[PDB]
Design a protein around this ligand. Structure first.
Ligand SMILES: C[NH+](C)c1cc(NC(=O)CNC(C)(C)C)c(O)c2c1C[C@H]1C[C@H]3[C@H]([NH+](C)C)C(O)=C(C(N)=O)C(=O)[C@@]3(O)C(O)=C1C2=O
Ligand SMILES: C[NH+](C)c1cc(NC(=O)CNC(C)(C)C)c(O)c2c1C[C@H]1C[C@H]3[C@H]([NH+](C)C)C(O)=C(C(N)=O)C(=O)[C@@]3(O)C(O)=C1C2=O
Ligand SMILES: [Mg+2]
Ligand SMILES: [Mg+2]
Lengths: 209, 169, 35, 159, 294
RNA sequence: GGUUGCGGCCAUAUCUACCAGAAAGCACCGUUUCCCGUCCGAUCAACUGUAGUUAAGCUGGUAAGAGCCUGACCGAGUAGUGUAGUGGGUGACCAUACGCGAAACUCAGGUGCUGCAAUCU
RNA sequence: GAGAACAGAAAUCUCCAGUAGAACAAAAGGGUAAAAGCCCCCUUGAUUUUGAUUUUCAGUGUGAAUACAAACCAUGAAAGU
RNA sequence: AAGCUCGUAUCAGUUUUAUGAGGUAAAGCGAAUGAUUAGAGGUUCCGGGGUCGAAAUGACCUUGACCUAUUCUCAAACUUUAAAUAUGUAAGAAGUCCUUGUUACUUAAUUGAACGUGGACAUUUGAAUGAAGAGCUUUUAGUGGGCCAUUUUUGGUAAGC
């Protein structure tokens, strides 16, 4: 068993997901997709660090789980459990097939799950404080050791996971049009109804500091 | 204000669900004939239930729709045997209300020893005058928001008329 | 004569299936039992 | 195992447009076709009677016969080493007019007009269309428009 | 009431046609009425459109065009009191008189009035207008009822019989006129003559005047105001019939307070829309009004 | 300019909440003799326009409204794609040359127009 | 969803919301809302005479289908079908 | 191969202009269907487990479920939108306009439909470029094992499959 990712590496077939036409498939090895203090706020974690792909390929579901464990173990052992939020941004939906006389009736049974990753697609995202740049970079270096292909650790200059680079997020927050939701934020738009905009964002519609 | 939108009784429905077919259902139909003065219509099952002992396309219930002065006198007799107290639930949120009586000998006809005992469900609906706009065929519509009688309007009307009282909630 | 009349159902389903609102798991236990 | 029915591979072809289901309209019922008109065939999925084959979808032909509820359209189709003429009996919901044909009629009316004046004033007609001639000599004013210098941007990653 | 419909629902929502949405036309029926045999290429299909409001009867001859339906002739029950009928403008006799009026008006307009005189001896018998040999064929219109029920004893079929007696070749059967007893499967000429000449109103008047003075008075105030007796309904309805046979030409009203005065003064209470700066001013005023965390 | 009847395009017209409607019209409305129809004059049929009402229907307005429509040099000449190279790279794939060229997003505007006939302070 | 004796999760009756999330004999796709769905009334166009056309195609056959013509009918107030 | 009728206004493995058609690449899921990660708020309506005076057709809760607004990722047999390349038709003389002839078709009709008579339409007869000719017919051979390359792509770990 356990054929190589070198024989399941490239994107050669059409996406073959679990549907009403493809049943009795095995479940993936990765079940948890967010690790660390997943209830924290974007005000708590400003710096974003991305592990991004540079090849068009297929990452195994179990490669995802193995890299997720080694990353989370290193970060928790070094900087504690509440110092980071790790989110895996690819989900294994492509069912990979195995053949197991001759090539007559060669259509195979489902074997595993894989996530198709494109060039410039984020695989891992970690948000953290400004001091933990070294430990986040080292943990994602272990993750890129365990994934196949060539990957890049980039310092994402967006406040947390969302959008809106750090000067822009500052100006929005001390303007007051940002409301703290669970693990994310809500924004004030100038297109909603006035009544619910008032009763959802009082700080913008007051003279508060 | 209140020019003509006061209230009125649209119809009263008498419903008996005997749960089986034959002599019992026919005798229930005779009870409805003698009470309303009007031919009853027998309602039919929808699906089989093993615990209920019912079969699909088997005649289960029987009901009569009455309107107007006969509706109000039947309502008066039903409220008289229900001693003019109704439990607030008993006034659904669209304003229409209803109750249920057992041993229908308490109102009207004597026993007629060949028919039997049949409890029945009174259900009454009310409308402000002008429900033809949502009932008629050409140029249909919906009643406005200063219409479509609510629970508070119905209980206010039912405490103004009939000298009745309500319960806790 | 006892004239007989049927209710014309305004329903299209002809399957002998109860609706999904008839789940026996959905049941109000601690319903008031008759004493 | 293999099927070639009348409506094989016609799923998205005979679907209706989005928010365009239901009854087809009385303009398409009251437009008139006379023998010799040139029409375009695009099947309407709601009317199953009189529907064409999938080959003739989006195809242009000359009407030759006009009857009670349908018209007959002559379509040239390519099979083998020759074109064959085909005589389809299609209903007026699947038949629509050809805006190339109406614009050709407006152009022949305009040409007849232009030759009528050019004969009245004795000037040459210049009737046929000319394609896009390249350009001509021009002067551009710098007054109020000084050329702003552009330079290639460096590489900054946005993610 | 928390039943507000979602944005996805409102996006996938296909609105019906305008007239279906306002519930005035049946497009299935409209299609089948106005679709023409394509081998005629230009001949309009003419509809005898009959409509009934609560106080008026509208009877029109309509043809169909891509730009919109156009009217060839019109006749109104509120124009009937010019002829002879000052009361009961929505009864069976008004329907028959309106059908007669619309038939005679369109034949006078089309110049087919010297021939196709119609009946002139109205007797309540069912006949079709036969084509005159060596001459123009009768004008063919099809009855457009619309949405009302095609029950036996309908004023739209009263107008149908009025048009058929007026001379318009309406294709019809006799199993919808009143007096058609399905047990005997024939027509009743006496009952249908009574219905044409308003006999049911007359028996109603004599029954009320015999039994209840207050109900007779309440329903028939204008009748007693004109002092019109219970047995003169046939006299006035006949005289209206020959007045229609005399002058089926449209006389418009006095038209006082002309069109520009109607536009200028009679309608100025329509409230005008605002523009962008006024809308922004109201928004800013509401911002100032709702300023603070109150 | 309204309103009615018939319509054309079929959301710029729909949906939700709230206001206004002088005239006429429309509507709600009253009655069961007849034709007729229902378990039921509620729908439908018939009679009166009288006893009343604009409460609804309808029409129009408002909403930093939902939706829908139009536009933009907003995104974006981006993704994608024809054609070419003894171009690159172990490959995956990418760049260039000559052409074509989106969708989402952002922002701005708008919220039915019109044909025939009749009627209206 | 809110209600009405027994009656409850679900038996029957109402009201409101409900762009089709149902049904259309069967596999899947398409289509359909005053209908093509569900009830009621009448019927036998599931008829006769041969032709033309489309699909597979050699532009042969078989099957299926389309539009007419000359009849005779059904239905409906009728247009029509 | 034999030709034949014309070499008289006929065509094109091509482009433009005008007008159609399509649902693939892309894109989308805070748009339908299906999949799917994570929190937030609410349901004085007990779905399940409790606690508070064994009580509660009572409160304090946990926890599901459901709903509302968000959020991460997708789909050959999902889709609002939607390319590029290929694809249909047209670019007059067998055409257009004006009066009036036939008809058992059609119309309410001296109205229409189809085919016509007569008259008008030259140094641009109505886009480009080409034509080493256009069209048609007869007869008959051999063939009816294929293979490779760029791009798209199916099955397979892959293959000089
Ligand atoms: C210019 N000439 C040489 C010519 C050429 C062609 N064909 C071409 O254009 C060439 N063919 C190519 C395009 C190369 C395939 C042509 O096709 C023609 C003609 C001549 C005309 C002459 C016509 C003429 N009248 C009507 C002006 C005439 O006198 C008669 C007659 N009444 O007998 C004709 O024969 C004429 O009508 C005619 O037939 C011509 C051509 O067809
Ligand atoms: C389009 N041009 C090339 C053309 C085409 C055709 N034929 C066609 O339209 C095509 N043939 C079809 C009908 C489609 C089978 C044509 O038939 C003609 C012509 C040209 C004309 C020119 C005529 C012209 N007129 C104004 C009198 C002229 O000056 C003379 C003359 N008297 O010298 C002509 O030669 C002319 O009469 C002529 O022969 C033409 C055609 O016949
Ligand atoms: Mg020649
Ligand atoms: Mg010539």
């Amino acid at each position: 068993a356990r054929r190589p990712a070198r024989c399941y590496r490239y994107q050669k077939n059409k996406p073959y997901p679990k549907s009403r036409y493809n049943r009795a498939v095995p479940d993936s090895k990765i079940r948890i997709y967010d690790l660390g203090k997943k209830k924290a706020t974007v005000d708590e974690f400003p710096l974003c660090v991305h592990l991004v792909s540079n090849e068009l390929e297929q990452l195994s579901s179990e490669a995802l789980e193995a890299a997720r464990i080694c990353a989370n173990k290193y970060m928790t052992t070094v900087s504690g459990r509440d110092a980071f939020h790790l989110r895996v941004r690819v989900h294994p939906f492509h069912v990979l097939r195995i053949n197991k006389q001759g090539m007559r009736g060669a259509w195979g049974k489902p074997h595993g799950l894989a996530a198709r990753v494109d060039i410039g697609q984020i695989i891992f995202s970690v948000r953290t404080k400004d001091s933990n740049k070294d430990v986040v970079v080292e943990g994602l270096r272990r993750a890129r050791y365990k994934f196949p292909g060539q990957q890049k650790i980039i310092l994402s200059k967006k406040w947390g996971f969302t959008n809106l680079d750090r000067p822009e997020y500052l100006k929005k927050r001390e303007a007051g049009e940002v409301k703290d939701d669970g693990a994310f934020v809500k924004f004030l738009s100038k297109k909603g109804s006035l009544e619910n905009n008032i009763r959802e964002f009082p700080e913008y519609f007051a003279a508060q500091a | 204000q209140n020019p003509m939108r006061d209230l009125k009784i649209e119809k009263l429905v008498l419903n008996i669900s005997v749960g089986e077919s034959g002599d019992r259902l026919t005798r229930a139909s005779k009870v409805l004939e003698q009470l309303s003065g009007q031919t009853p219509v027998q309602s039919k099952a929808r699906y089989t239930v093993r615990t209920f002992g019912i079969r699909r396309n088997e005649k289960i219930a029987v009901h009569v729709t009455v309107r107007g002065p006969k509706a109000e006198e039947i309502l008066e007799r039903g409220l008289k045997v229900k001693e003019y107290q109704l439990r607030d639930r008993n006034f659904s949120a669209t304003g229409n209300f209803g109750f249920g009586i057992d041993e229908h000998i308490d109102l009207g006809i004597k026993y007629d020893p060949s028919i039997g005992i049949f409890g029945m469900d009174f259900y009454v609906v009310m409308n402000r005058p002008g429900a033809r706009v949502t009932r008629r065929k050409r140029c249909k519509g919906t009643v406005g928001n200063s219409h479509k009688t609510t629970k508070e309007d119905t209980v206010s009307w039912f405490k103004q008329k009939y000298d009745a009282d309500v319960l806790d909630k | 004569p006892p004239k007989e009349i049927v209710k014309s159902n305004t329903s299209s389903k002809k399957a002998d299936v109860p609706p999904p609102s008839a789940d026996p798991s959905k049941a109000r236990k601690n319903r008031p039992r008759p004493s | 195992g293999k099927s070639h029915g009348y409506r094989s591979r016609t799923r998205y072809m005979f679907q209706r447009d989005f928010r365009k289901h239901g009854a087809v309209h009385l303009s398409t019922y009251l437009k008139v076709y006379k023998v010799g008109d040139i029409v375009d065939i695009k099947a309407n999925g709601s009317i199953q009677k009189g529907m064409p084959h999938k080959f003739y979808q989006g195809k242009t032909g000359v009407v030759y016969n006009v009857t009670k509820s349908s018209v007959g359209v002559i379509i040239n189709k390519m099979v083998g080493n020759r074109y064959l003429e085909k005589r389809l009996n299609l209903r007026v919901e699947h038949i629509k007019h050809s805006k190339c044909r109406q614009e050709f009629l407006e152009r022949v009316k305009a040409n007849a007009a232009k030759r009528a004046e050019a004969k009245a004033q004795g000037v040459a007609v210049q009737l046929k269309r000319q394609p896009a001639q390249p350009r001509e000599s021009r002067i551009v004013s710098t007054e109020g428009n000084v050329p702003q210098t552009l330079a290639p941007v460096p590489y900054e990653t946005f993610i | 009431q928390k039943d507000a419909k979602s944005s996805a629902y409102s996006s996938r929502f296909q609105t019906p046609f305008r007239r279906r949405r306002e519930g005035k036309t049946d497009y299935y029926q409209r299609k089948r009425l106005v679709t023409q045999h394509k081998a005629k290429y230009n001949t309009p299909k003419y509809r005898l459109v009959v409509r009934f409001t609560n106080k008026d009867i509208i009877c029109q001859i309509i043809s169909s065009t891509i730009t919109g339906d156009v009217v060839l002739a019109a006749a109104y029950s509120h124009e009937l009191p010019r002829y002879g009928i000052t009361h009961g403008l929505t009864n069976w006799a008004a329907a028959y008189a309106t059908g007669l009026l619309i038939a005679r008006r369109t034949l006078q307009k089309l110049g087919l009035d010297e021939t196709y005189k119609g009946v002139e001896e109205v007797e309540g018998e069912y006949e079709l207008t036969e084509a005159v040999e060596d001459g123009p064929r009768p004008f063919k219109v099809f009855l457009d009822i619309g949405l009302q029920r095609t029950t036996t004893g309908a004023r739209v079929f009263g107008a149908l019989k009025g048009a058929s007696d007026g001379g318009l070749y309406v294709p019809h059967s006799e199993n919808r006129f009143p007096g058609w007893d399905f047990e005997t499967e024939e027509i009743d000429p006496e009952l249908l003559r009574s219905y044409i000449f308003g006999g049911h109103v007359s028996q109603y008047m004599e029954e009320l005047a015999d039994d209840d003075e207050e109900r007779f008075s309440e329903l028939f105030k204008g009748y007693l105001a004109d002092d019109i007796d219970a047995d003169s309904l046939e006299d006035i309805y006949t005289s209206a019939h020959e007045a229609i046979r005399a002058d089926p030409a449209f006389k418009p009203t006095e038209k006082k307070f002309t069109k520009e005065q109607y536009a200028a003064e009679s309608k100025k209470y329509r409230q005008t829309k605002l523009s962008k700066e006024e809308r922004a001013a109201r928004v800013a005023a509401k911002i100032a009004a709702l300023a603070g965390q109150q």
